[PDB]
Amino acid sequence: KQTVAAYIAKTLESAGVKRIWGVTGDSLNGLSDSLNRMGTIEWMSTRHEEVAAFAAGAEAQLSGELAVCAGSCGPGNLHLINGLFDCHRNHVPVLAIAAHIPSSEIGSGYFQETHPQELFRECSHYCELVSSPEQIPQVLAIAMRKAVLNRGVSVVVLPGDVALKPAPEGATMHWYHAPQPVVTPEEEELRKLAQLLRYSSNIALMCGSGCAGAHKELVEFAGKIKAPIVHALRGKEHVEYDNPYDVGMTGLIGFSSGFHTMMNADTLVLLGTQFPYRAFYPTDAKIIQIDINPASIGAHSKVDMALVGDIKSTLRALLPLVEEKADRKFLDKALEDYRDARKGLDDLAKPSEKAIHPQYLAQQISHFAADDAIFTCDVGTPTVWAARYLKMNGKRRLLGSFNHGSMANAMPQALGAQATEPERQVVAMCGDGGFSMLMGDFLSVVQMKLPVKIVVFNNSVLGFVGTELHDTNFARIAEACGITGIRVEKASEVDEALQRAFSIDGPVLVDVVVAKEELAIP
């Protein structure tokens, strides 16, 4: 004998969830009451539910495990929506509990009435209203299983009255963790691919986050066929380290070596990528794509050969079939292009008496941040600088809103990262627009005591792609909130400001006045 809400909480507990992110409301009484009497799952109270969703997404990204957020009826859960798009687009396992108005009032135009079970369809792969307690075991099981195994958001919509009703007595709360299966293409398909590669030249690999966990195989594959690698942004943390074949990125924020290697390839292998910018794929090259998701195949380019498979096990099965190629002209030219490009990048990142080049600031962040720091970066120029200047190493992490493309993601994600890894350094590279767009949750940094290092790229503008922001002193604002604030205006002050911020035993905001820059590198 327990409530529907208790059944949910116990089942989550069994699946190993550690916390739920949200803001309360009366519609969530059943859930709050369960959490209080359970005393194991921790409630993380944010100032805006949007931030709860972002934070849960960051937690799921880092842990590889189901994360949970919740919102009260109407406006409460509606506030989650932009953060849930980010979670879903980032392919991270997140369950959203959307509390709903009393079921008796549905359809009458009631106080706070919305229809969450319709609103959230696009940003989830499962979304249903629990009208009856008898639904909860099936609805919760499918929701959790899809969130974890399909890697995305599931939404359970729970009227507050239904939450307080008795759960079905025979229902079980134990959760069996089923890992991903091994997914690899048919042997014949691998043989066909190997044969194709045998007779292809000037091959480049475009690698995305689907290569996570396959570093060793990827590097061995590139070396075997002599293929330079370019990586999509979400592949950066997984691909751009211990990798003599990596030659950068394309797209507008990429650089010349990535751009040319991609354009000039005669054969292109897309490995676990969704890189969306169609005009950056070459016009006449064979294109081969390997992905676990049929929906990704052909999404942003023609495809001459498609294979469904997980990158790690596909490459393991493929490697022994692939003959080593001696011809390395294309690779050598790409590497030479890369050397030139990096040098161009580096020339932009120097100290000056004029104004602080944000690329200098980003470079120094990378230089002084921990060996295993977790970085988040706001959509806007901070994404450009992170892409171009953060050095990855297989331990560091980079989170952003790279697919959904939302401003204001950095600090909220940092919040989730820091709570998930309390001992780890977390550095939020924020825009002034981004930081102020969800500024209220700066107070969460204090309230939750999460030592997040916030660095604001204060260009007092909405700089990426004019439209001015009033000269704001964020350091002063931090101090007023009870967090250490450091105002940086001279390039010579940068090094010491970052070192101080990182050493302080607590959260810090470094407010750096930076120059407006350009995207292209001459």
Next chain:
Amino acid sequence: MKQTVAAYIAKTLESAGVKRIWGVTGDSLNGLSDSLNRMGTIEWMSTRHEEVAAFAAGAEAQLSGELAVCAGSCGPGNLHLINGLFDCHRNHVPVLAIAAHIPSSEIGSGYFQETHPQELFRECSHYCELVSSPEQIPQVLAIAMRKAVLNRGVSVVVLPGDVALKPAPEGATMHWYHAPQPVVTPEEEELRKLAQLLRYSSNIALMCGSGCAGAHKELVEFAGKIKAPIVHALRGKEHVEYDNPYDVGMTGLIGFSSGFHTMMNADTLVLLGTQFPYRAFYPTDAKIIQIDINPASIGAHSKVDMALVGDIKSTLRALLPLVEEKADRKFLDKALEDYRDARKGLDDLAKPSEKAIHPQYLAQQISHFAADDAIFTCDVGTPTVWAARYLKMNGKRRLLGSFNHGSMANAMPQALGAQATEPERQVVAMCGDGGFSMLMGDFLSVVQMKLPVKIVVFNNSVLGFVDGTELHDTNFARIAEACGITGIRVEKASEVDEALQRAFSIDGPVLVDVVVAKEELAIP
């Protein structure tokens, strides 16, 4: 080489091997019709109601294992597809629907025939998008086709008639690379855990669904190794219920005692590739193990103590060598004995009589006289019960229905698709009188398309599965004759054998209108 968006679509489908498109025309489909006529390779199959086009395409996809296509004109045209598309999607068969749409310039104004197909079809598809711009078509079509084929379901492309007539992007490619399913099998560690669990479990039953298609050999070997009786969900019947000494029937209301009891009494239950939806028929204190390729199926209709994601064939192949042979066969032997009793009860109901024709007799005789490799379709209603209980399967015969979506009137439309896909093969539609008359207009398609379907109407002059249950008494044989198809009216049990034999021999379509009694479901 300039070409229209519609031509680009048609060429791409041609390259993917599509042979026909099912629909009814309209002006909003001019682009498409024009290019099908120019191309002269994909055949246009014109039905009387677009709902039937969708059912038929689903039957084609079910039988061929390959992408099938249907189309509808703007507004009401494509809207007519919807019930059939639910059936396709629920049956997990690869179908592309081209929904022609009003001219894009009139969208949002309350125009003649305005609907929003890109919203309507969300639920019965895994991909559904409006093509506003010619520049979309290569990506939209690629994703639509790839998802339909590999995710096994319906994709919808909504195409305003004016956009269809615009130039396709010049660099777009129309060649289609056929990517087969991957091999999907659980990690080794998980298989060893399962093997260990089975080693310490007793009284194991297997509940097998259509996910076992292609895995017959492994399934039977597995059951024999651990001594587990098999019960099958309805959509597993054609794949599981033959050359199988472990099979003990079905549960659910249309199942029977042996299936019922074996399921209820098991201490360990292994769900293999099944979505069997009737929650109260799963046992209450059993360990439940479920193997499925689709995370959404896991735990959908029962608790799950151990879940594994994997394809049945490849999972059982990897699992078998890890599983120790069990000597204890009491549970299996008792299930088999139950089964012997149940099958005798079933047989007692299927006898000729002077009173009235027992539909179960009729079904039994259909099974007896139909070809070794006949394709059967059956209407939702009593014909589904009789098919389930009396059609003998053998690894060549096929059974199609609307088993998940549960729509009346599916049998003849599916038969239409089956017959066109396999022109040399015998196709037998087991129809209800409600079902047949609900989409009766496409009976004319049987003549127009010259598809020798054998239609057998279970004429109980009622909506018998379930006020408004009485249908005015109707002679469907007479209606057939008036349409130019042979009609045989059967009212005495003694006439059944010869009526079926004549129908099956006739070189053309035939409707056999059999007056059958009302029957109870339970069996004494």
Next chain:
Amino acid sequence: MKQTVAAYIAKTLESAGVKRIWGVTGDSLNGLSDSLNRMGTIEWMSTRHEEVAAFAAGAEAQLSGELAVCAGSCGPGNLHLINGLFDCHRNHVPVLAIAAHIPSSEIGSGYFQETHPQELFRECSHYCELVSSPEQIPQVLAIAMRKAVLNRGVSVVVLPGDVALKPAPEGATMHWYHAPQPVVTPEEEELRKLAQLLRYSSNIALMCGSGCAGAHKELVEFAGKIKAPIVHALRGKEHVEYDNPYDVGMTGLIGFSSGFHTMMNADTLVLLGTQFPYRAFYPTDAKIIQIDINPASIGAHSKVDMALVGDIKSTLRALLPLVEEKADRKFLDKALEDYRDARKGLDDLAKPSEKAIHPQYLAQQISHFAADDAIFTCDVGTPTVWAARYLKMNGKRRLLGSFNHGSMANAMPQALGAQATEPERQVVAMCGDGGFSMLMGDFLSVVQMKLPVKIVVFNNSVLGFVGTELHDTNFARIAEACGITGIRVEKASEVDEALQRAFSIDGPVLVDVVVAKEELAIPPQIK
């Protein structure tokens, strides 16, 4: 009152005056069937396809002016209603759809027959909600019924079969108060402005749609006062094209020259209760004034220089005394002359011949021999063209079609609803061969319900309006096999007697008329 949710619904409908519910049963409808049986007042009308139940309910609501109801079982059952509900909603007729739903405990699990009707029906309704809890039903049903009747369109109530069987709330009331439409008239200032504008406008035409229903007298008086020819949109035909010396026909592709030119050449155009959707047929150079009760109609298919919200009857009554009589009638006289030419062209196409039966001859003869108060329905396709051009209206006859939603196969199903609603009245369905065969199963409903519909099939063995070839079918033979009289007509000389026979027979009849391919154009009259 101890009763179930379904019983509460049935009693409330009974109190609102509903006489019948159209549908096909299913187990998910047990609660409702149960209640209807026990009540014995509302009649269940069983069709062969639920799509037909929806069309038929729409026809009933169109003719009676009152709430009509249809129902469907869970999943495929109610899903089958959808195309007919689009027609109802687009025709602005009050219809409640009861969509039975799977047991609420199975929702979200991928259950047998699972759909989400509360999402599917959003576009073709102005109210659509799931009843999860018995406590909802009084509010949900009250809003559903009120919106259907007063907003004139479809409301959908989605009702899981288990919830249907639960107790209704004990204090709920089942009595229904009928609230009529309010009087809606523009503010006096706006009428004054309009009158002033008309005073200084010339060459004025009126484009009149079904919003003019009930305003014939005022409309004709208004046109005469300012000397404005009237053209009518198709759905205005039955309301406007009779006892009207100002009416000069229709535009659009199926309209004719006089309508076309009057519309194109006007310097001032007044849209009265119309949604005429074909944008290119509005004049490019004229002042446009639109009066409508629905803000969503204003400017939907043309620019608008002056807009007024009001009901046509009230608005014209308040406007007339403000409007000065105009002496200048050149524009009107020219339109009337154009009209005389156009009707003559129309008439020349409607002659008997030994070659083949011109469908326009067939339509003309239907109009000539049908009752003076017949109800006509016509399939989307050529029958709509012929009805538009050849049916003579008179203020008693009615014309139903699928004119906005534009669905094939509407004619016979609408005829079914019309005949049941008016059992003593002659109902003539002008069907296409495509239309008739597309929902042919419900031909059996004509027998089962014993509705004496007169079906006339324009058998051109093609999908003629717009892969169009249909195998030669003999529908008369099919009728006979179904137990209905069938008359096969192949010579023009046989038409007159075939129609007279069909209309006299005390029962339903199908007249299968082999007709020729035609064109929309009408050759000009001497100039």
